[PDB]
Symmetry: C12
Amino acid sequence: SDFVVIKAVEDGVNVIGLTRGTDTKFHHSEKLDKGEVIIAQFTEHTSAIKVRGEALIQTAYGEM
Amino acid sequence: SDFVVIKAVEDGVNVIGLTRGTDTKFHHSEKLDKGEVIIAQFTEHTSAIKVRGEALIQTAYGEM
Amino acid sequence: SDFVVIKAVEDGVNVIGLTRGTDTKFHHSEKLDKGEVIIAQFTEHTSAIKVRGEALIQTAYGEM
Amino acid sequence: SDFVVIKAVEDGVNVIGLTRGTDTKFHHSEKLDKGEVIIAQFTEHTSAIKVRGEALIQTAYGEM
Amino acid sequence: SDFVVIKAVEDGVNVIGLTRGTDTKFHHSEKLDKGEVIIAQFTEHTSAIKVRGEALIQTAYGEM
Amino acid sequence: SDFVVIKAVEDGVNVIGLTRGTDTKFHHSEKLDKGEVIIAQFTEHTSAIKVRGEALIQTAYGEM
Amino acid sequence: SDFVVIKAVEDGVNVIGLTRGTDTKFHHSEKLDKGEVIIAQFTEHTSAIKVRGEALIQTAYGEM
Amino acid sequence: SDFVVIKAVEDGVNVIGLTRGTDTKFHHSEKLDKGEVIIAQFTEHTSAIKVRGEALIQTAYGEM
Amino acid sequence: SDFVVIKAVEDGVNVIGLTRGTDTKFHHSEKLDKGEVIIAQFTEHTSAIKVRGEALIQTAYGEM
Amino acid sequence: SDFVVIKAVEDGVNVIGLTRGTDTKFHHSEKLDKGEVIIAQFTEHTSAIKVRGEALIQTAYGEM
Amino acid sequence: SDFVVIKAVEDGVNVIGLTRGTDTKFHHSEKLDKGEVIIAQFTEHTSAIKVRGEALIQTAYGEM
Amino acid sequence: SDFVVIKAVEDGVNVIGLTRGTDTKFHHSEKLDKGEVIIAQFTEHTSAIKVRGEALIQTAYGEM
Ligand SMILES: N[C@@H](Cc1c[nH]c2ccccc12)C(=O)O
Ligand SMILES: N[C@@H](Cc1c[nH]c2ccccc12)C(=O)O
Ligand SMILES: N[C@@H](Cc1c[nH]c2ccccc12)C(=O)O
Ligand SMILES: N[C@@H](Cc1c[nH]c2ccccc12)C(=O)O
Ligand SMILES: N[C@@H](Cc1c[nH]c2ccccc12)C(=O)O
Ligand SMILES: N[C@@H](Cc1c[nH]c2ccccc12)C(=O)O
Ligand SMILES: N[C@@H](Cc1c[nH]c2ccccc12)C(=O)O
Ligand SMILES: N[C@@H](Cc1c[nH]c2ccccc12)C(=O)O
Ligand SMILES: N[C@@H](Cc1c[nH]c2ccccc12)C(=O)O
Ligand SMILES: N[C@@H](Cc1c[nH]c2ccccc12)C(=O)O
Ligand SMILES: N[C@@H](Cc1c[nH]c2ccccc12)C(=O)O
Ligand SMILES: N[C@@H](Cc1c[nH]c2ccccc12)C(=O)O
């Protein structure tokens, strides 16, 4: 139930969930536009999140 | 039992629950108007929340 | 056992419980008048609360 | 486990327990007079508390 | 094991336990005099405590 | 494992344990004299403690 | 595993364990002299401790 | 796993473990000399510790 | 549920998951470019993370 | 998993583990020299630690 | 799920996992170069981590 | 779960794990040189750690 908050500062920001398991592949890519926010949990299927494109990011450890 | 608070600063703000599971898709979109607030938990079915349109957002980590 | 506090600043404020489950719909709408307060927990049946009309709201994360 | 404290600033303050379950109705209404206090827990049967009439209210999140 | 402390500032203060269950009624009323204190837990049978007459009250949330 | 500390400022102070159960009665009354202290837990049998006569009392919530 | 610390400021200080159960009686009285300290836990058999004679006392809640 | 630290400020300090159970008696007495320290846990068999002779004592609650 | 945040200050930064088990090898290498971020959990399969190339790193213990 | 840290300020410092059980005896004595440190846990077999000779000691409660 | 962060200040830094068990031997040695970081957990197989060569190290207790 | 950090200030520092159980003996001695660090957990087999030779040591309780 750990999560991350991501706000796209500029258009065309991209958020990628990476599969948990022995295998590691991108299983979903959610596209974000200027101002749009996403709050994503880590889950049974997502053990890593990748962020392409200039965004603003909050995590338990702080702001990016 | 982790949640997010979202208040629409202007009209026509949109809040999107994304399915938990192997698959990731929008299963519900709740529409908000100027001033209206929504407090949403993450749940057995919602592992990520998306926010289209200019809103004010609180999360465990702070304000957006 | 997480909850929210909602006080109506003006008449005709509306508080909506949204069903927890695969489905998401309004199952109850409680109407509030100037000054009246409601303290509502999230529950086996309510995984999100919506607030129509100008209210004052406290949550774990702070005041709205 | 969670509770709320309510003190009636003026006469004829009213405190309403709302049933927990699929259904949501008032199951009890306890009447309070100037100065009288009530400390009420959320319970197996009460998942939301409503307060009609001008009162002073403490919750985990603070004073109202 | 959550409790409340109640000290009667003036004579004839009254402390009322209200039944936990589907039903809500007064099952015990303990009377207090000037200076006398009572420390009462919420219990399997008491889910709300009511205080008639001018008292000083401590709870988890603070003084009232 | 919750407890209360009670010190008699003057002679003839009285400390009363009240039965936990559907029933509520005094099951023990321990008498205190000037200076004497008692540290009492809440227990399987004591769900409320009453204090007659001018004492000094500490609880989790502070000094009385 | 809750405990209390008691130091006798003057001679002939007395520390009394009171039985936990439906019954409440003194089951042990340990005698303390000027300077002698005792650190006593609450236990399966002791649910209240009484202190006769001028002592200095620490508890979870503070100093006496 | 709660413990106490005892350092003898002078010679001939004495540390006494008292039996846990219905019965309460000294089962061990460990003797300390100027400077010598002992760190003692409460245990399945020791529910109270007594300190004869001028020592320096730390407990969860602080210094003596 | 422990995680690390890694942001590439310059192009061609590399993030390597190392297998948990008796054996220790690289099982995945995710490539990062200027600005791109990755939030990675430790998992059933990743017990150590290696970071090649000039990055900015947050962990529970702080910034690197 | 509670422990103590002991550093010998001068030569010939001695650290003694005392048996946990109904019986209480020295089962091990580890000898320390000027500068040498030992970090010792309390364990299934050691419920008290004794320190002969001038040492520096850290515990959960602080420095000695 | 306790871990250590290690960043090589200079080239040719070496990070060594030591086997948990009755036996203690080096089972893996991961080599680090100027700037490269490694975040390593203690695990079912690694109960001690050794760091040869000039590095910067974060642990639960702080920086070294 | 608990660990200690040890950095050798000078050459030829020695770190000794002592067996957990009724018996207490050295089962491993790991040698450290100027600058080399070791982070060691307490484990099913190590209930005490000894440090010969002039080192710098961090523990939960602080620096040595
Ligand atoms: N499938 C991998 C994905 C992953 C998680 N954390 C990582 C850190 C680095 C590289 C890959 C990963 C896993 O579940 O473990
Ligand atoms: N169905 C996905 C949805 C998701 C959660 N967190 C994410 C982060 C990134 C991308 C997708 C997701 C899941 O339950 O895991
Ligand atoms: N029925 C949905 C309701 C919901 C909860 N949180 C949300 C966030 C966004 C959209 C819908 C929701 C659920 O239980 O998950
Ligand atoms: N019967 C509903 C009552 C309720 C609790 N929280 C709410 C929030 C909004 C509206 C109704 C409710 C339930 O148990 O869930
Ligand atoms: N019998 C009710 C009493 C009660 C508790 N909290 C309340 C709040 C409001 C009204 C009634 C109550 C119950 O156990 O739930
Ligand atoms: N027998 C009652 C005693 C009690 C506890 N708390 C109270 C508060 C008010 C009045 C009575 C009580 C019970 O166990 O619940
Ligand atoms: N035998 C009583 C003793 C007791 C504990 N706490 C008290 C408070 C007041 C009076 C008596 C008591 C019991 O176990 O409960
Ligand atoms: N045998 C008693 C010893 C004891 C513990 N705490 C006390 C306080 C007072 C008097 C005696 C005791 C017991 O286990 O309970
Ligand atoms: N396979 C190893 C990987 C590892 C984790 N932590 C380490 C520290 C140092 C060296 C290797 C490791 C393990 O699960 O334990
Ligand atoms: N064998 C005793 C040792 C002991 C622990 N704590 C003590 C305090 C005082 C005297 C002896 C002890 C026991 O396990 O309990
Ligand atoms: N195999 C040993 C390794 C070890 C852990 N901590 C230590 C401290 C000192 C010496 C050796 C060790 C063990 O699991 O316990
Ligand atoms: N074999 C002993 C080692 C030990 C741990 N802590 C100690 C303190 C003092 C002396 C010996 C020890 C044990 O497991 O308990």
